[PDB]
Amino acid sequence: ARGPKKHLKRVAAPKHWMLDKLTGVFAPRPSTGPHKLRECLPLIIFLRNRLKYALTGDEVKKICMQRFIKIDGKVRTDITYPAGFMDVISIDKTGENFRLIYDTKGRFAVHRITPEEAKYKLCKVRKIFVGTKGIPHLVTHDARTIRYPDPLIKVNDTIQIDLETGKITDFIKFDTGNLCMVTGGANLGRIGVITNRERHPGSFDVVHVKDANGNSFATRLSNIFVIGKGNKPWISLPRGKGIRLTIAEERDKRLAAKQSSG
C-alpha cells in the first residue's frame, strides 16, 4: 500500500469502543493526535455512542461546530479527535466535565468529575532530554513537551498539569507503595499499590501490583501509570474502584441487585 491508510474497518476497530456489527462497514478512524489510535476514544464515539447526545454522525458534527466541546480546556471541532487516558472533556453549555478513566473491564467509562477537578490532569513522563543551550525538557504520554521541569522528575514519574497554564504543579515519583493504574494488557483498568519492580536489562521490566482486596497481578513497566502518592489517589476513581470482580462474584452482585429491585 502506497502512502498512509485513511479508513478503518468496523470489525477492525478496537474492541473497547463497543461498536456493533450491523450499523456499517466502517469505523470513525481517529485522527492523528496526542494519543495512539488503538488506545484512544474518538470524540464521535464518546458523544454519540456513550452519552447519547447525538443519534448520527451529522448530529455530532453539528454539536462540535458550535464550539461546545473542550478537550483539556481547548475547543476541539474535529469529530475524530483522539481523546485518551486522563483527558478532561468539558461541556459548558450543559455544564458537565468528564475524565477519560479506564474501567475495570478495560473500557473508557463515562466518569463525571467536579469542575474544580477539571482544572488539572495527570501525565506520565515518557522521556527527559537536554537541548538548546542546556535547557531540560520533559515529554509526557499526552505528547506535550515541557521545558524547565523540576530536576527531581525522572522517567516513569507522574506530573500534575494545570490545564489553564500547562505547567507542572507537583509530581509523584515512581516507587513501591504508590498507587497506580494499568493502562494496557490483560490487567488494563486495574488499580493497586506497586509492590515490586524487577529489571531485565535489554528487555521489558515487570511490575507487580497488589489490589486493595489483596489480589496481585503483574504488568510491563510501560503499562503502569502512577495515580497517587501512597494509598490515596490524586484523582477521583470511577464507580468500580479499580478492583476486578471474578465472574462468580459479579453474577452474585447482579442477582442481589435483581432481588433488591422492586
Binding site: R147, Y148, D150, P151, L152
Partner: peptide, 30 residues
Amino acid sequence: KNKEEAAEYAKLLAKRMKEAREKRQEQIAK
C-alpha cells in the same frame, strides 16, 4: 516568557543543588 522561565528554573536549580550538596555532606559525615 523566556526570561521569566529561565529565572524561575535558576532558583529551583539552586535549591535542588543545595539539597543535593547537603545530602552529600551528610554522607561524607558518616
